[PDB]
Ligand SMILES: CC(=O)N[C@@H]1[C@@H](O)[C@H](O)[C@@H](CO)O[C@@H]1O
Ligand SMILES: [Cl-]
Ligand SMILES: [Cl-]
Ligand SMILES: [Cl-]
């Protein structure tokens with residue numbers, strides 16, 4: 001599923017991501033934009049053998065199990081495939097654990113490099129929220 005911008009903002013808000021850990025909804029939509037281009041089926045293989053999954057590109061080294069990242073953890077206690085669903089519940093619940101881990105949204109390199117310190121409210125401008 002390729003979400004629309006305002007559609008994803010609504011779904012993220014319904015799942016309680018807006019202002020979670022102090023991050024406004026615009027930060028989360030911006031992160032998803034540059035992590036996945038709003039595509040729940042996005043995947044990216046990393047040099048260390050891990051894989052990033054889903055609309056927020058959550059990594060198998062720490063957060064989900066894909067059976068092919070030797071020595072990894074599964075802190076969100078989910079198969080990584082669950083992170084590719086058109087329903088974003090699993091991704092949101094796992095993003096809540098990730099953003100609570102100590103470094104906030106700097107856990108998403110694309111957020112730090114492309115969203116942090118920008119006018120992130122622009123990503124929810126004009127949405128019926
Ligand atoms: C939360 C999450 O999956 N973060 C990843 C991190 O593993 C890494 O720095 C890179 C991998 O492509 O992009 C993302 O920031
Ligand atoms: Cl915002
Ligand atoms: Cl594994
Ligand atoms: Cl959803």
Ligand SMILES: [Cl-]
Nearest residue numbers: 021103104105
């Ligand atoms: Cl923080």
Ligand code: NA
Nearest residue numbers: 060064072073
């Ligand atoms: Na894992």
